[PDB]
Amino acid sequence: LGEPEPLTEKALREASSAIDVLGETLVAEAYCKTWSYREDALLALSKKLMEMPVGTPKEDLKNTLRASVFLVRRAIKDIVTSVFQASLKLLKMIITQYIPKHKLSKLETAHCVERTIPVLLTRTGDSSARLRVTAANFIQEMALFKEVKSLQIIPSYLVQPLKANSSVHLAMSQMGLLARLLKDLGTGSSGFTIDNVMKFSVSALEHRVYEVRETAVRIILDMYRQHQASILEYLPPDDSNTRRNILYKTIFEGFAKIDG
């Protein structure tokens, strides 16, 4: 049980503000090469956050939240599973317990979500299937927490178009999350719209990976079962020249199958 190594010059400037709020010891623990210290820092921070009394000044509560979110964000990228899992436990406590306990605003909730969800989505492209599932399940869990659901933030990340050079795992995970949360949250108040969903799905039909294109077809057909006529403007016209692309054939005779 030797002490954590010192922070590098780069880490020092990067974590400058967190050091003032949380102290150098805890930040050094979080940055060091010993996973059990990285884990302990997050669990210690978890204890510290919930022991802060109700009447604590709002600016101290917000600073502490912002410094903690800074550490959660880096720990979501951890190379050891236990540290990754401890960061999710901390993140959940901040959004679901700390914020409502101290009656903090929607801007704080939004800050937690905006700083962590994009980094968490990168972990849904991990090589480990068990890690992809843990990351995806947590995103689904946060998307349905009452305070986060109201902000409509998470659906907006899930409809962002798939990059050309995107991995097979990353693309499949995003599509899986889109389909599952679209069914749970629906259209209107959620942040999903016929507009952004179809825009995403039609764009995915040009992806290099067969399985990505195939899932886009499945989502388009599901949107036709629900919304019928209002999605047709997003697609090309139904005729035999369009049907010389094999995917659009499947879609349009798919539409024909769904009707009489």
Numbering used by the authors: 414 to 673
Q: Would you copy out the relevant sentences from the publication that reported this structure?
A:
Cep104 is a key factor involved in cilia formation and length regulation that rides on the ends of elongating and shrinking cilia. It is mutated in Joubert syndrome, a genetically heterogeneous ciliopathy. We have structurally characterized two of these domains, a central tubulin-binding TOG (tumor overexpressed gene) domain and a C-terminal domain consisting of an array of four Zn fingers (ZNF domain).
To this end, we purified recombinant human Cep104 TOG and subjected it to size-exclusion chromatography coupled with multi-angle light scattering (SEC-MALS) in the presence or absence of tubulin. The results shown in Figure 1D and Table 1 demonstrate that Cep104 TOG is indeed a tubulin-binding domain and suggest a probable 1:1 complex between both proteins. To gain a structural insight into the Cep104-tubulin interaction, we determined the high-resolution structure of the TOG domain to a resolution of 2.3 Å by X-ray crystallography. Repeats A–C and E of the Cep104 TOG domain are canonical, whereas repeats D and F are partly distorted. A structure comparison of Cep104 TOG with the TOG domains from XMAP215 and CLASP proteins shows that the conformation of the loops that define their tubulin-binding interface is more conserved than those of the loops found on the opposite side. Furthermore, the residues on that side of the Cep104 TOG domain are highly conserved across different species. Structure superposition of the human Cep104 TOG domain with the Stu2 TOG1 domain in complex with tubulin suggest that key residues implicated in the Stu2-tubulin interaction (Ayaz et al., 2012) are conserved, such as the W448, V493, and R626 residues. To test whether these residues are indeed crucial for tubulin binding, we introduced point mutations in Cep104 TOG, produced the corresponding recombinant proteins, and subjected them to SEC-MALS in the presence or absence of tubulin. Tubulin-binding TOG domains, e.g., in the XMAP215 family of MAPs, act to stabilize microtubules through facilitating tubulin addition to microtubule ends, and we speculate that the TOG domain in Cep104 has an analogous role.
